[PDB]
Structure formats: C-alpha cells, structure tokens
Amino acid sequence: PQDVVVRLPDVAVPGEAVQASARQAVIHLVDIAGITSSTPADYATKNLYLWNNETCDALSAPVADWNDVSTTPTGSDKYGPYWVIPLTKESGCINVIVRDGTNKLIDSDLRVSFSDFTDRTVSVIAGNSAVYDSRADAFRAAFGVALADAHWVDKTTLLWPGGENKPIVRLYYSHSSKVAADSNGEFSDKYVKLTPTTVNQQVSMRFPHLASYPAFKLPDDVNVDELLQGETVAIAAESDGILSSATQVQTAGVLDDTYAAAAEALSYGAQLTDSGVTFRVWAPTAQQVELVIYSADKKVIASHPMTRDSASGAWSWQGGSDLKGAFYRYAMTVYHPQSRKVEQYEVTDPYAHSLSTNSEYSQVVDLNDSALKPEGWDGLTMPHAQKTKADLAKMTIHESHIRDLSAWDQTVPAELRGKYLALTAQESNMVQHLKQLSASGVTHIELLPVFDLATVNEFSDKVADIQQPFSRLCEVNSAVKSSEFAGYCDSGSTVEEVLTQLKQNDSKDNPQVQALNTLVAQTDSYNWGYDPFHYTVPEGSYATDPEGTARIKEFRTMIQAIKQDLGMNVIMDVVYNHTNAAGPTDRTSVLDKIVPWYYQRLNETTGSVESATCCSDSAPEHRMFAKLIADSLAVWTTDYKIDGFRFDLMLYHPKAQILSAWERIKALNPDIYFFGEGWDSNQSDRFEIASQINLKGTGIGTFSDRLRDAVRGGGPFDSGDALRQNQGVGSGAGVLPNELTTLSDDQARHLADLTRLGMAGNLADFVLIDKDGAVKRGSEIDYNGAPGGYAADPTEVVNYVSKHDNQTLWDMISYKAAQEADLDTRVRMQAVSLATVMLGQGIAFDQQGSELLRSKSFTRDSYDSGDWFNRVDYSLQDNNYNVGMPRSSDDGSNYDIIARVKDAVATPGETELKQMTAFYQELTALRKSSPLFTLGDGATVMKRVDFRNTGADQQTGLLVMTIDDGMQAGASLDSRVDGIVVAINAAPESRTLQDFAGTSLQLSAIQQAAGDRSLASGVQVAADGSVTLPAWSVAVLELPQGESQGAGLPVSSK
C-alpha cells in the first residue's frame, strides 16, 4: 500500500540486431546486467572461442588457439554485443564458448544446431546455458517465471534460495490467471510480503534436504486456503523494484501442515453407508469438484457439485443406495503447476474399488456383497500360520505370474488361460503340479502385480496373443504390415507357429525370433505389470470379463482355490513407489491430476516429477499418500484376505512410513507379514529410508542379495565375458573353473562366507570363521564394501537364487558352468544352488519354475518379452531353453558370449525336469521336516547354528552347517533328534567328513526314502561315524534322540 512497485526493467523487449546471411551464423549476447543501465560495460574484452573437429564441423576457419582473444564482437547496441560467424555449409552445427577474455560466462561447451534454429541466428545470455531463437526469448526467459525452487513448507514458512539477501521478497497469487507483468510491465496481482527469518527445527525435521535454504516468513494471518486455490509465484527484487528472479512454488509442505490433520480423520472413495452412498475425494487445491454419474453404457446421468470441507480440503456428496453399481468420475477444476493452467478434466477415483474395462471409469461397489464373494469366502482360513518368528521362518515362496502359470497349458480350458480362474482347473497340469509342490512344503504363492496395471489394454479386441492367427497380429498392430514379417499376414499360421519356424535360422547375426516378438510385445496381453493405474482394484485383463465387478469375484475365487484346494498362503507384489504417469495430460495420470504436485516426488529446483524408480516417483513421505497406501493395504488385507505384501523398491519409502503402515495392518490382522526389495534409493537426504540396514530389528523383511550373488556368481550389472567368468558357489567357483574365469581360492572362499552367513540367516551379530580362519561377526563379512550380515532375526531376511527379474538360475548356470559339466551335473548344480536357500535359516523365496530348470533363452529382463520367453511348460517337454536370442536392446551386448556358451550340453527334457522336480520336493520337505531349520529368533540361531570346514585350509565348496537340539541350547525343539547336520558338497570331488566320528549320525529319513533319486544318493554313514559325500550332492543327517535329551552339537564360543 506503501510498497515499492515490483516491475520489469523499463526497456522494450529487444528485437534482433542482425540476421545471418548465407554461409553464416549469428550469436547474440544479451547483456541483461547491463540493460538495467549505468555502465555501458565495454564489450571489447568480450570474445568467442570457436572450434570444430568432432561432433560439430560447420565453422569455416575456427581460431583453435584457446588463448587467442581476437574473436571479438562484430557490433553492438544497447542490448549487448553480437557475432557474425562464417560457415562451410550452413546445414549442421557449431561449437562455441563465450568468454570475457580467457574467463568465461556460460558453464558449458554450448552448441548451436542448425536443425533447430534454421536461420542460424541464436541468442544466449551470461550464466544461462540455453540457446534461444531470438533475443526476445532470451530476454523473456531472463525476466520470466522459471523453475520451482520455492517451497511453501508450512503455513508461515517459505524456503527459497532466490530471495536470499534481497530487499523485496513476496509471494504473488492469481486465482484464475498466470501471474505475469502488466501492460505497464509491472506485477499487479495481489501478494503477501515475506520477512527474512531462520528456519525452525520442526521444519528442519520435516525437510532436512531443504534445511540449508534461506527461510522466509508470512504474516500470521495470511489466508492460506485462498492462495492454494490458484497459482502462487515467489518473486524477489532489488531496491528499485526491478525483478531479480521469480519461480513457481512447491506447496506439498503447506498442504500437509494445513489439511492433513483434518483429512486423515476421513474415509475416501465411494462408500456404501446405510444412508446410501457417500463419495469423498481429497482435493485441497481444487476450485470445483463435481461428481459425474454414468449409465451402464457410459452416458452422463447426473452431475453433482460436491461439498468442500474447509478444514480437510476434501470434497463429499451423499447419494442414494441405488448408486450401487454406477460408474463415476470426479470432474475437476484445478490449477496444475506443470501446465500453469486451471485444468478441467474427468478423473477416476484414486480410491476406486471397481472399474470399467481398461479403467476408464470407477464404479461404486460394496466389497462385502455376497454377490462378489465365492461360496464360503468368509470362512477362508490361513492354511499356514504366521504368528511367531518360527511360523514366519517356515515361509517358502513361489513367485508366480498369472500368464506364466496358464498361458501355455493346453490342459487349462482355453477361456481360462492367462486368467485368475486358471487356478480352479483342478485337473490341469499346472494346478496339480502346484498341489504337489504344496504337498512337499512350498507354502506361499507370491503374485506378480494383480492390482490394476496400466500396460495391458483390457479391450480384448485391441490385443493379439501368440496363440492366435498372425493375421490378427497384423489387424491390431499396424507396425507389422511395415516390417520384415509382413508376408505372414496371409500365411494362415499362428504367431506361435511363426515364432517356432523362426528358431531354425535364428542366431546372433540373425536375431529374428526376438525381432518378431518385439512387435508382438506391443499388443499382446503380457506384462509383469509394475505400472500402477489404480492401487486397489484387481487387474481387469486377468478376468474373463473386465467390465465391472466380475473381476472382483473371479479374483477371490482364485484366492480361495490357492488357500483351500492348493493349501498355500498368498502374497501380493505391490508398487506404491511410483505411478504410471503424472501431469494433466496422460490417460493413466490419476493422483497428479486431482492434487497436482502433492503425490509425486519433485526435484527441489525444477519441480519436475522424478523418475529414479523408472517412471513417476511417488512421494510416500507425504501424509495423505501414506494414508492412501495404508487404506489400500487394508482393503487387500480385509476384503481380499491377502496374507502378506512385497513392496517393490521399498527403499524409496521412509522407514517410519512402512512401520506406520504395518501397525495399521497389524491392528486389523496381527499376523500379516511385510517385506520388500531395495538397493539404490539415494533418498537418505530426505528421510530415513526403508533399507536393509535401517530395518534391522523392526520385523520388516528384505530380500538379501548376499547369498544370491554368492551362489549365482557375479552381480546384476555383469555383461559379456563377466557373465561367464563370475562363477558362483552353485556353478563351481574355484573348484570346477571354466576356461575364462580367474577366481582365486580366496575369492571362492569369500563367496562361501557369504553363503554360510546367509544360511544362518544373514544376521549382523552371528559369529563365524571366515576365509582366513579369523573370527568375524556377520556385520564384519564384506559385501561389496558393506556389512554382509544386517538382520536381527532370520525372519528379516529373504534368501533366493532366482527371481522374476534378471537371468533365471538355469541360465546363469549355463553362462558359467565349465564345458566338462554335463547336463546331469548342471541339474544338480541347480539343486545345490537352491539347497543353500531351502535348507537355510532365512525365509525361502524362489522363482516359479526353478523346479523345472526354467530358462528364458538368456533373457535378463523379460517384463515385456511375452508368452514366448517366459513360457513354463507344465507338460514337461523342455525348460524353454534355446528358443531364440534374447532381446537385442537389453541383451545384445551378450550375444557373443551366448552363442559361445549356449550349446555346451543338450536342452533339458522330461527326464531332467522330472529329476529336478524331485530334487526340489526333497529339499522343501527337508526344510519343514524339523523345527531346527526354522528357528525364527536370531538369538536362537546364534545359540544353536554353527559351521564346520571353516578357515583358510577348508575343503573348497563344502558347506557344513550344524543345528543343535542338545543341552547347550535349551529345550529339545525336536522330540526326534538332538541335532542336525546339513552338508552341501558343491564340488567335483567326493569328500569325507570326520567331524562326527563315532557319534551315531545318520542320513535323514526323507533322503533315504528317495533312493538313488535323492540328492544324497551314494552318501555312506560308516559305523565309526565318518560320512562320505559324493560330488555335487546335498545330505541332511540327524543325531537320534534317546529316552531323554542328549548332548547334540554344541556351538563353540569363538
């Protein structure tokens, strides 16, 4: 009122000094600092460095002497200097650097492509590294709103670097337009002034990554709720009111400080009460929300302006009970900072609980209706207990996929192939194999994404699968008509048949199976599905009918068949760490359309949605997304009876967030198990991440990569010859070397430390003898510079040697096994590999089909490689090995080593698969054959679990583990044995154990029953108590328990 007027510099927008003529380019330097006059700031010291050579070669005679300053401006006007630059051809690009003497002003070897600016007349500006098409663009950028490095973090606090040490600091706002300069070049919209302040600790706690930011203070009476209705720009100016900078404002902090407290007390979605249906959606910044209501054929039949609750920021409307079954969306009117527009669009409900086909509309549903439950649903019990640490330890997971399970199975009814309902085909090969796996002690099926994914089109008409005519492929995929496979549109054979014919002439120089499959991938039904569209509705394409609630009942039918007929618990993979899209445009941007910039994690400076996850990084560190997650998990827990959840990329989540979620779900069902996967994150600066280290002692499990890398060999980044040289314990590291490896005995001995430690459950405090005979705690064994042991209890550790991502176990072994290793040796290598997991104290996890030697033709990342490369054949003809070179984009640089190694031995057939299945069932039956394998508690494991054959002079590749049921340990947990010995001999030599001489040790009953089909076939226990172990074998032995408890196998104090 008294205030200085903030404004542009009173000078017109500059035109162009010179346009370039033929064989010329022109470069303007827009001296912005000078144009707010005073000094004529001489331009003779200004100069260009121009050099050609690689990348850009269009200049005509570049002065390559770096010091030579002589290339000074051709002329100047009041807006600065400019340069006329001769060229060779005028189509191309040039390399330029801009300098004040040998000093320098644009921290970047900048470049001028003539393909963008075809008049070759561009402008730049001291500091910016951008290349503008005119001085006016540059000038406007210089004085226009840019980036979004202002953070309105609570009601009275704005963190912003742009305002540091500036007299005028203000928050401008326009409810309905962009904030911009006047007809008079002034900023006339309303504003609040910001007084410099010091940030506080409540906000330093909340935003540690922003704590070095200049803090600014808002009058205690600012009408916050009105500022968040529109656009909010932060602006800084000098004493004359001329603008220094202006940026957009990230508002997520102040939205939580303002509304989260009230909004967490509310329930969301379309909710059947007894008064009818209540709709509520959280839209704290929206200007309008209307509830549109749709007919069965998707016509508008009502549109209701909703009631905004001023405290929560949530919008609600109460309607009739006849809205049950109606399709609906929210018609939003809302400012989006990305587009700087008050957008208008219809968004489906992020709390949707049912959907129309391909998720176009959300649908009012009562999940409690018996109409959407299969008969007996409410009685469904957990076939396996999860209460105690010992209960959880017995967990043995089968990581599976809806289409992997049934797509190829001719014994599944055609219409159920690739569907939730394939699991009811009680006499299919797939289902009876799973029933057998369960019988032998697989306990858990883990489901790859069955929530609503984005990346399969649920309109069946727009989708062709390889089991269908190839002409169907051409109809729905127009790229096919314009490719080397066009001839097959009339062939009258299926895509499956065409792919089989392409095997014959397929090689590293004719990778044609992959070439056709790549196009199939775009329009088939196949995807892992790590692409969330709606978090709390079943995927529609796995239903026999994706329109409406059909999927809800079919899914639960599937859940029933796994728990009741199959006798297994059920785990869901869940992806709360990202969304499929953000912004106001994209079909699958849901959350970021309704409350823009609140649900995604943004770069502190630009405000861009980060993509470290792959995609649109979500922001689970914000309260209303934490609630969304917990409410979502609750529905899956209560309404779908899911027994546990695997968090994808769990370290992009705050530890406190996961724990808070777990407590909410423990409150509904105390035995639900939580675990997740995580290795990169790099979000440590924003909060304490949900990582392997930090989660110690919480009871949240994590995939361990330690044993995995030690038994598989190498790591996930390997390519080329490293895939072969990096043998593991499972593939003969240092005992049966191949022709390329260099692994020393020490390197091999270290892998074995990682593997014992993992078999004892990868505890930090478990004490063992290392490769050099030194005493070490699990934390003290090294895993690529990190402590190897990180857990408090073994139930915090999930062990595995194969998984959906990266190469399958069989393919790793094929990469790494010595040529002399024959097929049966490779089969036992698979079995010994898996024994380190199945006989270990950690939770046991494994890829569907390891019991069938599953291959993906060396495909490392098969998320989109279709029915073809992920084939699992429950008719036991082969293991899908050698069905073509894998996709070139991701595996092309491995074609050389593949062709070199691929044909060392024969492709596994029915005999080998059947042999492997028995090996597998033997191991899992052993895992549950005695409680000593699954002690549960970490203090119990240290007290009872020990190793032999340790130290520098160990027999390489021979793991000997003891479990004690004797007196030094406490109660006899097994009323049949006093102790157990697990001997895994991953070596070509036979080995003899003397540690148990004259002690009445004996082979386990399970292995003795399997005869010469046992992994222990050929093991002899002498009367003097020595044990002979055949090459490549796994033996489990027992101390028989007498009339009272014996002395067992006490752990030594090291």
Ligand SMILES: OC[C@H]1O[C@@H]2O[C@H]3[C@H](O)[C@@H](O)[C@@H](O[C@H]4[C@H](O)[C@@H](O)[C@@H](O[C@H]5[C@H](O)[C@@H](O)[C@@H](O[C@H]6[C@H](O)[C@@H](O)[C@@H](O[C@H]7[C@H](O)[C@@H](O)[C@@H](O[C@H]8[C@H](O)[C@@H](O)[C@@H](O[C@H]1[C@H](O)[C@H]2O)O[C@@H]8CO)O[C@@H]7CO)O[C@@H]6CO)O[C@@H]5CO)O[C@@H]4CO)O[C@@H]3CO
């Ligand atoms: O998200 C990434 C990744 O995370 C997980 O891996 C973790 C792992 O479990 C930990 O043990 C550890 O990783 C260490 C690793 O095991 C060691 O081998 C070593 O790695 C070094 C390599 O030896 C060395 O060669 C080099 O790596 C370079 C590669 O040679 C080069 O090709 C490129 O890497 C690219 C890959 O080739 C390419 O496949 C792709 O990587 C993807 C993964 O394959 C995919 O599985 C997933 O990776 C997860 C993995 O599943 C987890 O287990 O996504 C990846 C997307 O990037 O793309 C790569 C990028 O171009 O560049 C690297 C440059 O380093 O150096 C490495 C690093 O020292 O030490 C490892 C330490 O990281 O931690 C990781 C956490 O990432």
Ligand SMILES: [Ca+2]
């Ligand atoms: Ca131009």
Ligand SMILES: [Ca+2]
């Ligand atoms: Ca879907």
Ligand SMILES: [Ca+2]
């Ligand atoms: Ca696909």
Ligand SMILES: [Ca+2]
């Ligand atoms: Ca970051």
Ligand SMILES: [Ca+2]
């Ligand atoms: Ca006992």
